[PDB]
Subunit: 48 residues, 2 copies
Amino acid sequence: SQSRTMKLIKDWKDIVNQVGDNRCLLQSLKDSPYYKGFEDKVSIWERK
Amino acid sequence: SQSRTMKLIKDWKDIVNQVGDNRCLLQSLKDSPYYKGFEDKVSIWERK
């Protein structure tokens, strides 16, 4: 109403759906038998 | 004294000095200007 200007943020679903895809992709990586040698990077991206 | 047998562990300094070398090596990596793109693996090895 009074004259200010802020950078509001739109298109949220585009951002959130990528995050959901990445988390279910990590769950898909959790079923691999070679997960025991790569678990430590998965922990990073999990918490991130 | 009574007859048992356990695998006791010797040569400790050989193991510990490698750990000290690795921690001071990480500190040497902490002075690099390109540390901002590789900080996340350094956090892993730091806590480990």
